[PDB]
């Protein structure tokens, strides 16, 4: 029985209260297909909640394909995962879903988890289940000219930009020499969650949110006051995360490749994203 960790992140993972009997409300897609829901425990002291979306569908497919049972919980600290110094020593540790997987609190990460060199040093990623990149979310009418725009390059309190703390976006800005000026600004303004940042853009408390295009393009498709700015840096992928010791690693990647090849992954897009 696999411990799955995930994270709230529409449209990959919706998180809703249970009904009073502790079950999940029967709901249906646009096309009349039943929305598949799983009980996921998470913080408020954990309580049972209802989880669904692209990644939950994918989990269900993997579990059925490879013949495993599971229980899903939401990452305790609410973060994706970065590697941080311990106790002003030279030793580092991962937080977020990365940390839970490494510690054994999870056996698998099933989430919009960015595949990159730094995480791949510690965990195993599947082949990508989705290809995407970064973009910037702004209010309609804000006309950001890309990364070199003077509001980003020469920051002031007049135009606030930020990302999510303890995501790979945070660490990318922390580590790239060319982003040192941007990082010093964002460090003052980073949010705990994407959902909070997204609302802050709508509420004009944040002017630009730098985040995953899979997520931000979906937000802009649902909310006509919000727009994105196109590809920001290089392209990236989301992958299933597993320990190096996992016996499941080959079959997870084979099932992802199968699901791309037979149209299942594209069908998840049509359901949750388009």
């Amino acid at each position: 029985r696999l411990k799955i960790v995930t994270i709230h992140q529409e449209p990959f993972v919706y998180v809703k209260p249970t009904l009073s009997d502790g079950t999940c409300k029967e709901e249906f897609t646009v096309n009349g297909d039943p929305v598949k829901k799983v009980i996921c425990t998470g913080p408020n002291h954990t309580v049972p909640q209802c989880c669904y979306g692209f990644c939950i569908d994918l989990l269900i497919k993997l579990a059925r394909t490879m013949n495993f049972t599971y229980e899903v919980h939401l990452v305790a600290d609410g973060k994706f995962g970065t590697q941080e110094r311990v106790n002003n020593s030279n030793k580092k540790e991962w937080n977020g879903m990365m940390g839970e997987l490494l510690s054994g609190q999870a056996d698998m990460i099933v989430a919009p988890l960015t595949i990159n060199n730094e995480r791949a040093q510690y965990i195993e990623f599947s082949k990508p289940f989705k290809y995407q990149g970064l973009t910037i979310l702004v209010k309609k009418g804000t006309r950001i000219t890309g990364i070199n725009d003077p509001r980003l390059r020469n920051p002031s309190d007049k135009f606030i930009y930020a990302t999510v703390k303890q995501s790979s976006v945070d660490i990318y800005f922390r580590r790239q020499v060319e982003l040192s000026t941007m990082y010093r600004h964002m460090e003052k303004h980073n949010y705990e969650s994407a959902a909070e940042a997204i609302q802050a853009v709508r509420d004009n408390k944040l002017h630009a949110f730098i985040w995953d295009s899979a997520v931000l393009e979906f937000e802009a498709s649902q909310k006509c006051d919000l727009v994105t700015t196109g590809e920001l840096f290089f392209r990236s992928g989301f992958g299933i995360g597993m320990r190096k010791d996992s016996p499941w690693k080959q079959n997870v990647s084979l099932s992802i490749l199968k699901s791309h090849e037979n149209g299942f992954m594209e069908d998840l897009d049509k359901t949750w994203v388009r």
Partner: protein
């Protein structure tokens, strides 16, 4: 020498481009890498000679970067038994076969990651996004692979004339997913990409279904920007090109990490700019 690796490739511009060696020097010009091609003496023989050739392209630049970063040397050769890889009577040929049968430690080229191949070789992380795209003349209305004009061709009069280049990942996919489409399109099989582009341009084909990355490149360079890919360059069955290694290869970890470092540090974008950009 455990550090010295046999590596197989396959010509497919702009990923792998093959040129003749200057016969005077028998040395490849700067920026290219030596690559040997076994060329038979006749058709009735296994007898042949290795011909010294020179290889370049997007994938050869990745190989050079890997060689520097992961610290291996190599002898590069061109596959002569098939192309990318197909399973025939349960026996792999092409680059996949070279790796399966341990003649190559790795395969570097425009080699599509798919499920069936991943059962017999390990693949690196994807280093180029690809999948299946469809090329048409501008004006041609096709929604996608699921277009009834492809799935149920004979409902239309005249029926759409469309093909692929057989024996690779694209044909494998169509065969597996769309039986009627597959058997219909065998009549329009093209010997290679160049033949297909000529067929499109001379009205002998209405659509060409093929690897997305190559089609995007060809569309990008088409004289007059007449040939395009459907959608905005839409990709069915998204995957990538990957380096194929032997099952349980000791090189896979470092190759994966190096590729991810190249993407992360901007090096991969430089290579796309150098090799893959088009006017269109």
């Amino acid at each position: 020498d455990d550090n010295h690796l046999s590596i197989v490739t396959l010509e497919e511009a702009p990923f792998v481009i093959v040129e003749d060696i200057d016969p005077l020097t028998e040395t490849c010009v700067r920026n290219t890498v030596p690559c040997r091609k076994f060329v038979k003496i006749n058709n009735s023989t296994n007898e042949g000679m290795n011909v010294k050739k020179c290889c370049k392209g997007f994938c050869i630049d990745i190989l050079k970067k890997l060689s520097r970063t992961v610290k291996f040397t190599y002898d590069l050769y061109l596959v002569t038994n098939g192309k990318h890889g197909k399973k025939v009577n349960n026996v792999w040929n092409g680059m996949i076969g070279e790796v399966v049968y341990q003649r190559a430690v790795m395969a570097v080229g425009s080699l599509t990651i798919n499920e069936e191949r991943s059962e017999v070789v390990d693949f690196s992380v994807p280093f180029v996004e690809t999948g299946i795209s469809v090329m048409v003349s501008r004006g041609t209305q096709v929604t996608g692979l699921s277009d009834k004009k492809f799935q149920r061709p004979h409902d239309y009069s005249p029926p759409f004339r469309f093909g692929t280049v057989p024996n690779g990942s694209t044909e494998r996919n169509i065969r597996n997913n769309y039986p009627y489409m597959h058997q219909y399109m065998t009549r329009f099989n093209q010997r290679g990409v160049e033949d297909a582009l000529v067929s499109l341009k001379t009205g002998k084909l209405d659509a060409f279904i093929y690897d997305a990355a190559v089609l995007n490149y060809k569309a990008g360079r088409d004289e007059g920007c007449k040939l395009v890919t459907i959608g905005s360059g839409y990709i069915f069955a998204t995957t990538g090109y990957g380096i194929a290694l032997q099952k349980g290869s000791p090189w896979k970890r470092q190759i994966d990490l190096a590729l991810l470092q190249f993407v992360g540090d901007g090096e991969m974008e430089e290579l796309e700019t150098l090799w893959l950009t088009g006017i269109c």
